Each structure stands twice: as structure tokens, then as C-alpha cells.
């Protein structure tokens, strides 16, 4: 009814998307909601097309959307990405990731979807 949790905020959306893009950079396969999947796919594609020339200013520009993981740390994963993904993905115009729709969840019946990337 009346006053409750703050719930969904734009800050929540952007920080969650940052978590997902960090996760896909670390491993490369995330199972989540299809709408959230495409919403983060747009931002990931924007970051990757911003990951072509890679000056220090672009390093900070893309760092404004990255976090840390257990396998890699922030600067280390940035450098790792810069070293491998950019040579692999530079020559393809767009389409740097794909989402595949899974089935409902026994726990939640949510339409699961897997984001993956391979060029």
C-alpha cells in the first residue's frame, strides 16, 4: 500500500548494468532477464565500439562503467580487455554479443536469457 522500499532507481539500474558488464568481461556468459539483457547489450556494444582507439581519456571513459571481480582487478581487467578483445573485435562492425532466450525458472518462471560473446 503506502510507504515502502525505494525499490527500482536509475542508480540501481546503472550500477547493476556495470556489474553485468564487469561479469561478462571477466567470464563472458550471464543469465538474466531478457529486457535487462538487451538494455545491458546496448551499453556493452557502446563500450566495445568505444574500445577501438583506446587512449588514456578513453581508458577513463570506459572505466566509468567497470568494476572489479575475483579473477581480475579493475586496472588489470582493463589492460587484459585492451590486449585481447580489441584486436579480436575491431574489424567487425557491431554485433559484438548475442543473447539466447532460455526457458522459465522453476524458482521464478522468469524468462531467462544468456548473454555471450565470441567473434
Partner 1 sequence: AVQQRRSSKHRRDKRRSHDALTAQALSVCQKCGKKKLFHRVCSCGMYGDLRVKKAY
Judged by the rule CB under 8 A, the positions of this chain that interact with partner 1 are 29, 100-103, 114, 116
DSSP H helices, the chain, are 10-26, 34-49, 56-63, 74-89
d(CA 34, CA 71): 26
Phi-psi region of 54 (alpha: psi -120 to 50; beta: other; left: phi over 0): left
CB of residue 115 to partner 1, shortest distance in Å: 10
- The residue count of the chain comes to 119
CB of residue 94 to RNA, shortest distance in Å: 3
The residues of the shown chain that bind RNA, judged by CB under 7 A, are 1, 4-11, 13-15, 17, 34, 38-39, 41-43, 45-46, 49, 57, 60-61, 63-64, 74-75, 92-101, 108-109
> Dihedrals φ, ψ of 27, to 5°?
-110, -60
**13: partner contacted, choices RNA, partner 1, none (Cβ within 5-8 A by kind):** RNA
Q: For residues 92 and 116, which CB has a smaller minimum distance to partner 1 in the complex? A: 116
Amino acid at each position: 500500500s503506502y510507504i515502502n522500499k525505494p525499490g527500482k532507481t536509475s542508480a540501481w539500474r546503472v550500477m547493476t548494468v556495470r556489474q553485468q558488464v564487469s561479469a561478462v568481461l571477466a567470464y563472458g556468459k550471464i543469465e538474466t532477464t531478457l529486457k535487462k539483457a538487451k538494455n545491458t547489450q546496448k551499453r556493452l556494444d557502446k563500450l566495445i565500439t568505444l574500445a577501438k582507439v583506446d587512449n588514456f581519456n578513453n581508458r577513463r571513459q570506459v572505466k566509468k562503467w567497470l568494476l572489479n571481480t575475483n579473477l581480475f582487478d579493475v586496472d588489470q581487467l582493463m589492460d587484459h580487455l585492451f590486449s585481447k578483445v580489441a584486436p579480436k573485435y575491431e574489424k567487425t562492425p557491431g554485433g559484438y554479443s548475442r543473447v539466447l532466450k532460455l526457458g522459465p525458472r522453476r524458482g521464478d518462471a522468469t524468462e531467462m536469457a544468456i548473454l555471450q560473446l565470441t567473434d
